[PDB]
Design a protein around this ligand. Sequence first.
Ligand code: J4V
Ligand code: J4V
Ligand code: J4V
Ligand code: ZN
Ligand code: ZN
Ligand code: ZN
Lengths: 518, 511, 510
Amino acid sequence: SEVPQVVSLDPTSIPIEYNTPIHDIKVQVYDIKGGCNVEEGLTIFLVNNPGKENGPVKISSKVNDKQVSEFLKDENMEKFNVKLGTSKHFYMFNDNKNSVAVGYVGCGSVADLSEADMKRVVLSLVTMLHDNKLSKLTVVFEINVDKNLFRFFLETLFYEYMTDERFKSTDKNVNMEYIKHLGVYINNADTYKEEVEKARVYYFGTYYASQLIAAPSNYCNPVSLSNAAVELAQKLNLEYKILGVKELEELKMGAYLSVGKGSMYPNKFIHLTYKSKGDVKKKIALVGKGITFDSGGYNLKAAPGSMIDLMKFDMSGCAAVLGCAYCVGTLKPENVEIHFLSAVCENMVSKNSYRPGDIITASNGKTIEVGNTDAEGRLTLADALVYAEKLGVDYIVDIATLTGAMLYSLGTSYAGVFGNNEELINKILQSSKTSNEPVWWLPIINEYRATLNSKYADINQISSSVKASSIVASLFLKEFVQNTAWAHIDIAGVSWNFKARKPKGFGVRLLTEFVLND
Amino acid sequence: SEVPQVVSLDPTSIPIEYNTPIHDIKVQVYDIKGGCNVEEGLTIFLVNNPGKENGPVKISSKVNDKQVSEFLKDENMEKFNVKLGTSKHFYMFNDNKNSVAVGYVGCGSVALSEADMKRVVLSLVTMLHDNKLSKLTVVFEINVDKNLFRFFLETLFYEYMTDERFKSTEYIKHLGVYINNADTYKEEVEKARVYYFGTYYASQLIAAPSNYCNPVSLSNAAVELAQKLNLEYKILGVKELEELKMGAYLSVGKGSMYPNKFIHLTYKSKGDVKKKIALVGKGITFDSGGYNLKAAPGSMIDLMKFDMSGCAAVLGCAYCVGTLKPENVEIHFLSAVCENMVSKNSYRPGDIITASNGKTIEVGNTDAEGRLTLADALVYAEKLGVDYIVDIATLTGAMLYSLGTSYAGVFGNNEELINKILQSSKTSNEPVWWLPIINEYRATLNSKYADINQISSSVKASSIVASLFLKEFVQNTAWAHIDIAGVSWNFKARKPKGFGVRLLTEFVLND
Amino acid sequence: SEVPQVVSLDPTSIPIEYNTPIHDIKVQVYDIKGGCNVEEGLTIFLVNNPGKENGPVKISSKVNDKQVSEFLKDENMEKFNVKLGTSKHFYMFNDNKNSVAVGYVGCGSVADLSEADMKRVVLSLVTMLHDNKLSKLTVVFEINVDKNLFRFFLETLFYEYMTDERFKSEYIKHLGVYINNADTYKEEVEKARVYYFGTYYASQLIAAPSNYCNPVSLSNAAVELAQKLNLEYKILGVKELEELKMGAYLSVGKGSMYPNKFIHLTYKSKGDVKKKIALVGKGITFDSGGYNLKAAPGSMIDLMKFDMSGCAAVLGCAYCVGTLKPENVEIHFLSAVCENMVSKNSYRPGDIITASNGKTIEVGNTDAEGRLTLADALVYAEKLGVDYIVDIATLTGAMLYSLGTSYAGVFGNNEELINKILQSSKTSNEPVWWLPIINEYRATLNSKYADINQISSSVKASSIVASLFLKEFVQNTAWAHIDIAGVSWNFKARKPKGFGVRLLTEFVLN
Ligand SMILES: O=C(NO)[C@H](NC(=O)[C@H]1[C@H]2C[C@@H]3C[C@@H](C[C@H]1C3)C2)c1ccc(-c2cc(F)c(F)c(F)c2)cc1
Ligand SMILES: O=C(NO)[C@H](NC(=O)[C@H]1[C@H]2C[C@@H]3C[C@@H](C[C@H]1C3)C2)c1ccc(-c2cc(F)c(F)c(F)c2)cc1
Ligand SMILES: O=C(NO)[C@H](NC(=O)[C@H]1[C@H]2C[C@@H]3C[C@@H](C[C@H]1C3)C2)c1ccc(-c2cc(F)c(F)c(F)c2)cc1
Ligand SMILES: [Zn+2]
Ligand SMILES: [Zn+2]
Ligand SMILES: [Zn+2]
């Protein structure tokens, strides 16, 4: 519980925003068939033009205002085209003699927007909300989207609109006003109304994960992060337990404890639980890799391109799981019991650190020969998986920033899923589809398993010959799941949004949809 | 004050020689218009030959010994030339029928800059090595102004002196100089000897390895220097640094076994104080790189005891100024001393740390630690209420590629200050070149999360980016920044130069 | 003059656009007193807010349109801030029920913009231009600007607006500027349009890939340009170069399939010649590094079509000079053009070669080919009997570490000349900084076997060592050297800068 400091200026907790400006936006959804009122703030039309690439803008909604309708006639709109991401602002006086702002965002010629397409549309919208003080935004859907796409639109709008300023001091943004109101006009509005607060919930789970991830390693360390988890748990009425180093010792988690040996922060193992009232038909363990900083240890990340300064991101898995805990504990699904786990620690260089060559002992009794101290994540997951399976659960799913190789196999958009069970793997892919968080199935190639045979220990931690690191790491983890359906989601390549210089909070929505659809 | 040790064999202070053999040299300046008495020791003529390529050696000076006069005849010296750096030894018997020794050092054709003179002195010094002599006599047959004559002496003393503090397993006693208008030059002699020691003192600290020279022992050394000079002094410990909120500077020091010690000396003139100056020195006693470990080929980790050269320069200057006692000024000598190490307690890449002026900083690379310590030292300096702040630092390796090993670079926010630094470079004979603070690059220091980024992810002109970083930590005071990373260590001679002591003292005195 | 080909599909000329849509834009300058008219197209106000960082937009100019005035009233514009480069533009109906777009570009909180600042402002302007179909841009200056900064604005606007599409498989026709004391600025317009093209032309040669822009085709371009400007011209081939004994220059080109070509254009004033000037551009069409191959990571071998950026700057200046026709001057535009390649015929590390002035040189690294070609170009320049020799060259990577991508370095043996280059830098708004030639380093070029070393094996101040090497080939003439290795390529925008054209022209003109 008590956070150790080297000097008194050292942070003793992670600053966390719960009540964001997003939560104070009133959202009303109207059915477009009754005509739009254009009275104030900024009103934006989402417009496409099927078949005609960069075709003209034609506004098809009924607008309950003559002056605004006059302005929006197709003769006046013909000069503008629907090229995806394009936008324009208009200015005019409505019938009540009040100035209003109107505009549109282009959605292209394909009548079916992908997640990536919709993200580009939301990002254009957000540029319109920035550097303009508005009290209200109104969005008019003149494209077709299903309920899942509609929620994704909101989540993405909320997340991208919110600005993280916890660590600004003298350099706040002086003109950062937020709208207080969001209006939405859409066909068959009644069926979309329920997606609003779900979106609001999914947004905060993501944003919450994002806050933890972006929080630097001095602020976010194993004690302060496990402290953050308790506090979250206390707010959602989840059972929680935090296992300290001595409880970890009696459980014999030598693989996990070895990784943390060189840190000034004691290892902390997070265990949150949500249980439905009534009959529990499904028991699930979600495991998140929680390395608050990864220097590589004695295999120091010193090589060019190793990006040691990003390595605060190595607890993204853990963050996704705690954000999932927020969503699950908030939306309170039935017929399920979910354990939220994370073996939280820091991989450091010290006289106390574990060394390359060290043979260590996992809690299932297997000896492991460390080949590289920078493959610390799989060692922590090993003990966490053994703990997970001892809970007697139906599914074990881990999510982790595990291997750099993901950048070379799938890149920055798709996470890879590996697993020992096809039904479980298809359930993740379905959740991938409905969370709109992209995932691709990659194989566990058993032919490589023999390169993990250690001459002295039971098993090698790393291969000395296979370069398919993401696959080898999956093989190693499989060795610690005895007889349970298990899946592994590697998010090393997708966790961090390099272009925006911020986390994505990737996985929160994937994991929650997974829980809900079960 | 107490120096922590890991083993009982770890040193608890820096050995420092205050009274050097150079100090035991009696110096006499004579007018050459009165003739030379070549009787004892070794007598050397500094000869030129204006314009005439590698002209012959011509002895212009009058010599009060008939015998030597015969030897030094124009006929005898014609087979010798005046090539810059060349030398010959002469042996003879004088009018007294006593054995004497004579020779010359060639000074070339051009009637000499700093770099020229050095090669002259290194030739002289070679003659003083591997020959036991009780006195050296030097006859000028070249023309030097007063600043250049002092440079000759400073450089002679510095290169002659040999640092033996770390060895375990015959200096001359008199220096005679023959020069025209000798009376104008005499005043320069003890000024040179002071400048020599402030320089050699800076060299001692720098050359002292990091197990001898740590934040505690260096700051004890500063106190000991203050007490001997009767300077006022205050050493800030971790508790007061915490109270002063020096979060940037304390972050760098987190990983070390030696507590941070902030050095603050003050010289104040009696009478009316007209100019208040803060001199700030980078004082990293060892730079491992931290978690951005200096492990790349060419990063030269074994050199990094030198990373407190700025502090050395400032303390060296304190000796000079405390000795020469100028009027009308108050000088604050500052250095945020710490060690940058790898430890469970070290600061990490990515960390967000808060400076004493309230500014949050995203750390991009733990090896850019110099500018973090300077940030809080600069906030401190400006709070003193001064007119000028000059910092000097082994800040960026890029200096080697811009100016190389000869010229330091100065940056600043004030043209008048920069000119004064440049004018001081001229009279101190420590070359500096003015480099621009290019504001176009400032946008890359914008952090997504913190008030400011420590480093740029896209601009390769490191010296300028660092200068832009420091500028954020001076609000409304004339400031300049001397980057001595390239010029501080002499790779040829394998020793410090003590670069900047003379430069900063000339700046102080001239104001 | 005939371009050799490996296969029949290899290009044999560099495509050039001489007539550009910028040349068809009608530019009018109006005084701000009297009020602004807002009748069509896009009207942009350039606005700052002194002292108030990210402070609100305030429009002070009278606008002779009641609808647009309403839009520009204080209570509506303060919704926006003046943060440098920030923009907003809106479509509305004006008094005549005509659709006009009105907006602004934030010019920050500083009352006198720098060249980098103005560039950020223009980029924000061009974004709106590229994103709207427009017949007219009207720009209203509510910020302070001197004649040279006004011209620099137009120049940059034209350059950044222009899109180079030669290698791919609707611009405005009117530009209106409102500004106080409009009459003092009007003369800058056609000057800007000429400076723009010299820069754009230089841009075209640089961007042209090495299979397109080779020594033979680049010299052909220069002939074509000189013919269009009635400049005298002479292209030296290998036979003449051999007779002139240009051994350093020829050695660099040995490995290429393209023969060396030496460009020599000359402008002469109608009246008496009072000043003779030689401009010497480095012209390596492609630098593979030679046997010291650019294989090290970060050496950016795919960029090395830019290694003729100096020659390009020289030829753009020739366009400007031949067009504006300075008086009392004679100017020689020179470039020793070749290609540094790997082959059985290449020169080798360790080779000792003989420059045209008799100095033997020990090659230490074949990727230091630029100073080799410049040595013979400088000798050739001095044999002309000129008053100033000024060279411009992508010479040393180290410039990225000293000045970066914004400022070029200038080195020289003469302080009058350097202060002229410096002054030219100020009036052209092409930022340059004076760097020293440190003589203490000269000894590292003392070869054991040859007269001189091409490189130092010890000193790391490369841009200074190269300056020292080039100094050896200029005996008694005022000379300056502008290293543009760092500043020549706009990495952010993925295109050339045409850097140096305007700087060399201002030097020639003023
Ligand atoms: O340190 C790691 N996990 O704790 C992990 N290391 C690996 O994937 C490789 C490394 C370390 C090992 C030995 C061998 C195969 C495996 C294990 C090379 C890893 C994970 C992410 C990244 C990574 C690096 C980036 F630059 C980046 F932009 C990113 F998104 C991820 C790099 C290495
Ligand atoms: O450690 C330094 N300051 O505390 C400094 N480092 C840098 O300039 C690099 C480091 C820290 C930065 C981020 C990135 C680029 C820049 C700035 C790596 C630095 C200073 C001197 C030297 C240096 C190295 C030599 F081999 C040498 F001979 C010398 F004289 C100086 C190298 C790096
Ligand atoms: O090849 C060159 N000129 O023909 C030049 N080369 C060098 O400066 C190297 C060559 C020649 C020298 C000795 C040693 C180090 C230095 C100086 C190898 C040079 C010029 C531009 C660049 C360069 C590289 C970049 F990646 C880049 F973005 C840029 F703008 C310039 C790199 C090297
Ligand atoms: Zn790792
Ligand atoms: Zn460092
Ligand atoms: Zn080259």
